[PDB]
């Protein structure tokens, strides 16, 4: 019941940096690899050194070099640090093919090595952005090959959603749309997260004046471990990744649950506050704590899963659920009666030294399949239209070999996706 973590691009790697740091914090792992104690993510060598089961890929050396110069470079095996010599210029054409195609075989074989190291691989998780090159384009290439050799193993993807505020590439819509299609084709579950919503949480609930990616990544990393580490460690009601597939995807296409997380409270505001299971879950149904820029009250629910860490009793959860059903404004779709899944571990939430969040006694992760996701898609469609109407910058992809129809096609596929969410939301 092991897994592999794949980090592509700076978005994937920098997030990964916090993720593995967190895993060290969860089990008392020293940077040197020495750890006296997580076998799902680490393998052990005869030296008593543990090695992260992960692959870090960046087509430009720069970020990988950062890894190589950091403290955890002694944790990572040199073969897991793979780099190219030039980026994709924020461009899928290069990421997916022109450049990335020259490295991907190395990458896949290192994955195989790890796959052979694992005895019972449940699956793997991938981190990347939607708008980058390496992070999007290369990622697409990668998933094409992984679904060939692994197939059936869990394909979890964590994708960064381009915000209107932050925008670092003018052709991000194009990059994102191309990517999206391929993730529809090969992922099992995609989680897109909006840095702009996260910033909002950090400035209001963590009270942070000036959020950076380093703080943003800490938040995300903890959420990801609450989903996985928490499954590995055992608790009361353990919930496997295969159960998430089974329970969260009603139709082959609706594989886009979103995440909301609480408690996200600064130490200073946590004093004085004690949240019950019910109260934390009430925070989880608030749009203001949503890690994606959309409105949960607008959309309808199809699936919802709550995962618990630390001090939680099933009974309290049962009461909390009743409250959500009655309080809310949780319009669930007829197609799914009641769909709330509950996983409860005993493992307590962990705290990062030099962190920005309070120590908490219980924590809740909300995963949910809601029709509000279409909203985000609509925003991207529009942006595409504008760029594509003029065909500004199109030569940067076409000149690398892309076909006009390929862009049309991908957009259309997203339009279909959104329409499918509409359809499922239509009660029947």
């Amino acid at each position: 019941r092991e897994c592999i973590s794949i980090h592509v691009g700076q978005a994937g790697v920098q997030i990964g940096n916090a993720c593995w740091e967190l895993y060290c914090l969860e089990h008392g792992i020293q940077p040197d690899g020495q750890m006296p104690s997580f076998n799902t993510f680490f393998s052990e060598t005869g030296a008593g050194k543990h090695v992260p089961r992960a692959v870090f890929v960046d087509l430009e050396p720069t970020v990988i070099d950062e890894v190589r110069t950091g403290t955890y470079r002694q944790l990572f095996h040199p073969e897991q640090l793979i780099t190219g010599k030039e980026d994709a210029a924020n461009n899928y054409a290069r990421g997916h093919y022109t450049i990335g195609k020259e490295i991907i075989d190395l990458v896949l074989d290192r994955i195989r090595k790890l796959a052979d190291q694992c005895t019972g691989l449940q699956g793997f998780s991938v981190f990347h952005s939607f708008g980058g090159g390496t992070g999007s384009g290369f990622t697409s290439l990668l998933m094409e090959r992984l679904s060939v050799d692994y197939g059936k193993k869990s394909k979890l993807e964590f994708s960064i959603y381009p915000a209107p505020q932050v925008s670092t590439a003018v052709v991000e819509p194009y990059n994102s749309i191309l990517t999206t299609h391929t993730t529809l084709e090969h992922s099992d579950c995609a989680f897109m997260v909006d840095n702009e919503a996260i910033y909002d949480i950090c400035r209001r609930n963590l009270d942070i004046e000036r959020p950076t990616y380093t703080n943003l990544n800490r938040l995300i990393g903890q959420i990801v471990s609450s989903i996985t580490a928490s499954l590995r460690f055992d608790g009361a009601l353990n919930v496997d990744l295969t159960e998430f597939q089974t329970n969260l995807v009603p139709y082959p296409r609706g594989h886009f649950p979103l995440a909301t997380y609480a408690p996200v409270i600064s130490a200073e505001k946590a004093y004085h506050e004690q949240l019950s299971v019910a109260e934390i879950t009430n925070a989880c149904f608030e749009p203001a704590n949503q890690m994606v820029k959309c409105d949960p009250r607008h959309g309808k629910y199809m699936a919802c899963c709550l995962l618990y860490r630390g001090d939680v009793v099933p009974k309290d959860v049962n009461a909390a659920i009743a409250t959500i059903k009655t309080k809310r404004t949780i319009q669930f779709v007829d197609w799914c009666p009641t769909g709330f899944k509950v996983g409860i571990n005993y493992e307590p939430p962990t705290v990062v030294p030099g962190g920005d969040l309070a120590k908490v006694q219980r924590a809740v992760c909300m995963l949910s399949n809601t029709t509000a996701i279409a909203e985000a898609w609509a925003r991207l469609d529009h942006k595409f239209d504008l760029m594509y109407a003029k065909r500004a910058f199109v030569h940067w992809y076409v000149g690398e070999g892309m076909e006009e129809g390929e862009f049309s096609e991908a957009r259309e596929d997203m339009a279909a996706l959104e329409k499918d969410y509409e359809e499922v939301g239509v009660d029947s």
Binding site: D234, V239, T246, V249, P250, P314, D334, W335, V424, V426
Partner: protein
Amino acid sequence: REIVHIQAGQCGNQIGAKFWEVISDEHGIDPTGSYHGDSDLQLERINVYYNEAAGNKYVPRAILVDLEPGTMDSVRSGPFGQIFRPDNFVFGQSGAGNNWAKGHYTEGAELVDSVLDVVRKESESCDCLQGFQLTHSLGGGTGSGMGTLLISKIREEYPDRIMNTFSVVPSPKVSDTVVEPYNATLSVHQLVENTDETYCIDNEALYDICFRTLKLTTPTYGDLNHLVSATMSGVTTCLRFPGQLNADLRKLAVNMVPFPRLHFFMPGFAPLTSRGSQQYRALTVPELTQQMFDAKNMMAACDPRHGRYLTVAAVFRGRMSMKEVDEQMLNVQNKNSSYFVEWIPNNVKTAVCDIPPRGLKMSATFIGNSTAIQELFKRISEQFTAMFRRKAFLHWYTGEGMDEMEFTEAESNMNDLVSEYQQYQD
């Protein structure tokens, strides 16, 4: 005379944890398995639930099963984990996600075959099985899914043994998952054909008991599952210890089931009140019968007086006279005759045994079979139809391979059960 118990899912695991705790208390068995009892009678029928291990240590005749290691480990870490043998820990590593299709239909089936082999091993070690007891949820993936698979296989192998199960019933105020009605419907469909009886306990009602009568401000599952275990142990007290009437579960089944398909029961319990008032209590049989009749002391979320009784079983523990019990329970029927169905003269049957629960002088367990129960099925079927009509979340089960008609037929059978209660109602 022996019973094999199986704990499925967290519910099953935790309720059963309390159950086995209680049963060992009943017989003077410490957490190591060593017998340090008080009486000879504690050993005299210890075989129903235990194997005697070398050194006068006992092993509970029961299997712990789940798809999540953590739960299993947490049970094993507590007292009474030590009493269980490693051979009874069967589990996987990935929950079902609350999906009956994953538990029953796919993944859980993979473990079920190994569970059944352990079951068979235990039934072979037994001299004569009386029956099987399962503890599980009606809404969870392994509790309702895996567990129902297991049941179909066990009943198949042992047609004349008593299959009973205790299970947690969804409520509007409890409901966690949107597909909980879907899981419930599918399990009900199977349970109605494949069990001899099932007890319907609702956490909502249990919470009310805890606060209203037990005066607890914070009801916890640790105490809620305690109340369930009281009733679970009550039903085999006479089986395990000498008494006067109806010890056998089959005898009870005969007297409690007027029609093959109506085998759902309403458990309740007396005395059930906080300590504050206990100093003013004076337990008598009328006192116990007052509390057992009163709907507020039912563990099922359903008021019998809204429907009509087909059968009532009352089990008494501790030294009470025959007259007192038989007169008073007759009087219950006499005084509340409007809530009983006229088909059965003497609707109330009693069992009386001579061994009281530790800490009480006397106690009584209530088992009802009233047409009021249909309300619980209405809650489920209704919620189901709302989801089902729109097919919300259905794709998660169709992903496993479940057919819309599988669910349709499941509903149909639920509707049948309600209609049959109505046919008997009046």
